[PDB]
Amino acid sequence: SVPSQKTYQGSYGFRLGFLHSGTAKSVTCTYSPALNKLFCQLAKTCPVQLWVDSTPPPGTRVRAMAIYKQSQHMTEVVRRCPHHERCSDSDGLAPPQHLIRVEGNLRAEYLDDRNTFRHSVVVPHEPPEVGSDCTTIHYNYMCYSSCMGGMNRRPILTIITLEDSSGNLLGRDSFEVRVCACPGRDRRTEEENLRKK
Numbered sequence: 001s002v003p004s005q006k007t008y009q010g011s012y013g014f015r016l017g018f019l020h021s022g023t024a025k026s027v028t029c030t031y032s033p034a035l036n037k038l039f040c041q042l043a044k045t046c047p048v049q050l051w052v053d054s055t056p057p058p059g060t061r062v063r064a065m066a067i068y069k070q071s072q073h074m075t076e077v078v079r080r081c082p083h084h085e086r087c088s089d090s091d092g093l094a095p096p097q098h099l100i101r102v103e104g105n106l107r108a109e110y111l112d113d114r115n116t117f118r119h120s121v122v123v124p125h126e127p128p129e130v131g132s133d134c135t136t137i138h139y140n141y142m143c144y145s146s147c148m149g150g151m152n153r154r155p156i157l158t159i160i161t162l163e164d165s166s167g168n169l170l171g172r173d174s175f176e177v178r179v180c181a182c183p184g185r186d187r188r189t190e191e192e193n194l195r196k197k
């Protein structure tokens with residue numbers, strides 16, 4: 001009833017990486033290592049790097065799923081709010097209820113789990129291109145953390161799982177996400193709150 005969030009590099013040394021985008025007021029996506037928390041604007045590109053020590057087999061996939069971070073909300077499916085699920089902003093592939101989309105990957109598949117009702121988006125894992133040391137998935141988050149009737153100010157985590165062709169676990173990593181109007185200011189504020197604490 002609750003997806004695991006335990007970090008697990010597995011046999012391939014799987015882990016995420018994030019760009020260093022800074023905290024200017026204009027920044028649209030920024031990652032705080034101190035908080036393990038991505039701050040992003042609504043529906044903007046969030047680059048998430050996938051790092052491995054060795055190449056996983058053909059047919060490996062990479063799944064993203066959101067859960068509520070607070071234990072008392074963890075059994076509730078994270079979904080878009082009653083406004084955004086009805087705003088007809090379909091990309092033609094993502095169901096309108098799904099918070100997390102993958103940008104620019106026609107092989108993305110969106111799952112409504114028939115048992116847990118949780119949403120996820122999964123893409124094939126690809127080896128890095130020539131001259132690159134990792135691959136990158138571009139995610140979009142389609143509601144604000146503050147959306148009433150949806151996340152409703154509750155923090156979420158994104159869990160990224162590396163899976164084999166059957167969906168079995170090969171690796172797992174995760175990060176908190178805040179979807180907000182001013183990620184740069186919010187990252188600065190939360191890092192300051194962490195330093196003061």
Ligand SMILES: [Zn+2]
Nearest residue numbers: 081084143147
């Ligand atoms: Zn919303």
